[PDB]
Each structure stands twice: as C-alpha cells, then as structure tokens.
Amino acid sequence: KIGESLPVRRSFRNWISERLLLDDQSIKPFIAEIVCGEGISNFWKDELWVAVLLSDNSSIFFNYFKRYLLSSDQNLLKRLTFLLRLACKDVDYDLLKQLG
Amino acid sequence: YIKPFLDGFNGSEPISELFKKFILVEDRLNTYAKFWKVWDLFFDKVVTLCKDGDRYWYVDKIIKSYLFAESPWKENSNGWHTFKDSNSQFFCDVSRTMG
Fold it and tell me: Which of A4, A27, A45, A84 has a beta carbon 3.0–4.6 Å from A19's, enabling a disulfide?
C-alpha cells in the first residue's frame, strides 16, 4: 500500500527511528516479523537495518539476533558492512577547514 | 558427551526419558546457556522425526517430551527461570516447522 518511491522510504526510515526512541514495545515483534520473514522485498530489509544501525539502541539487536547472524553463512553480516560503509557516514568539515 | 545419542537417534522410548531428566536437572541447577545448547543440538533430529507422522513407535511421546508437556509443573507459575524474551524464537521455529 505505501508504495516504493524514494520519499516514502526516507519517511519510513524516520518513522522507525522515532518508534525506537519512544519505547513502543509493539515495534519489536514487527521488526522480528520482517527480519525472519519471506516474501518481503529485500530493499525494505535494508532500509530497516540502516534505521537500526543509526539508532543508539543498536547493540541490543546484535544480542537478540546472535544465532541468526552467525549461522546464516554470515550472509546478513556481510550485507551489514556494505550498508554501514555506504549510508552511515558524514562530511568531515573540521578537516576541510584545517585544509583551508 | 551427547554424541552417542545424536548418532543413534530413533523413535524408541528412552529418548523421551532422556529429555525429561534434562528438564529436571536444569530446574535444580539453573544452567541457562548449557541447557539451551543441548536443546539446540537435537532440533533437526526431532524435526526429521515428525515428518514420518507422530503415530509410529513412541514419536508422539518424544514430541511431547521435547516441548515441555510431560513434566509435572506447579499449579500457578508466573514463568520459568530458564525462559527469557530472547528464547521466543524457539517456539517461532517450532510452530513454523512442526505444525
């Protein structure tokens, strides 16, 4: 229903990031249903993991999904490094200022 | 330790008695991670066994033992000291696979 265009994806990522801040415990079953689910198109799983990796809560999910991360031939754990290197970075304006 | 029972696994009655004794000793000792390691190693064998149908030999009794249904629990428990939020994935896999 919500569609697949890019402004919607940004708004979904914001919405998840807010639910993880305001402690609505109904979200954790939903997140588990996606992460263990089938038929969900993979770019939604990627947007969800970017929201997790940008949140302060992040270490909790590694505790919760330990055996899933390890046993799946580390396939998901490899995707996480790709997403981390692409999305989770920012411009280093201090260093630009020191270079003039 | 458990390798002779993993290699020889079948539908015979002492497989049920084994699971009941592990549950009893864990209730005495409260050794969380070690219990869940033992339970994680038997999962695929039990899953393979139910696909023959639970009417054979003692298969239904083995299923009931593995899923905590044969032990004499107290009448008004709030929970069990070996169950935590993380372990809900066990019942998810079970209901996905042995339904």
Answer: A27
Resolution in A: 2.9
Can you read off the two tokens belonging to residue B95?
């209901």
Interface residue B41 vs chain A (CB under 8 A): no
Nearest Cα of chain A lies from the Cα of B34 at a distance, in angstroms, of 15
SS3 state of residue A26: coil
Method: cryo-EM
Instruction: Give Cα separations from B33 to A51, A66, B8, B40 (angstroms).
Output: 30, 13, 25, 10
| CA gyration radius, chain B | 14
Chain A CB within 8 Å of residue B86 CB: yes
CA pair distance A64, A66, nearest whole angstrom: 6
Residues of chain A found within 8 Å of residue B40, distances taken between Cβ atoms: 67
Q: Provide DSSP, B31-96.
A: -HHHHHHHHHHHHHHHHHHHTT-TTSTTHHHHHHHHTT-SS---TT-S--TT--GGGHHHHHHHHH
Closest by Cα among B43, B55, B54, B60 to B9? B43
Judging contacts by C-beta atoms under 8 Å, the chain A residues touching residue B89 are 32, 36
B-chain residue closest to A63, CA distance? B86
CB contact (8 A) between residue B92 and residue A36: yes
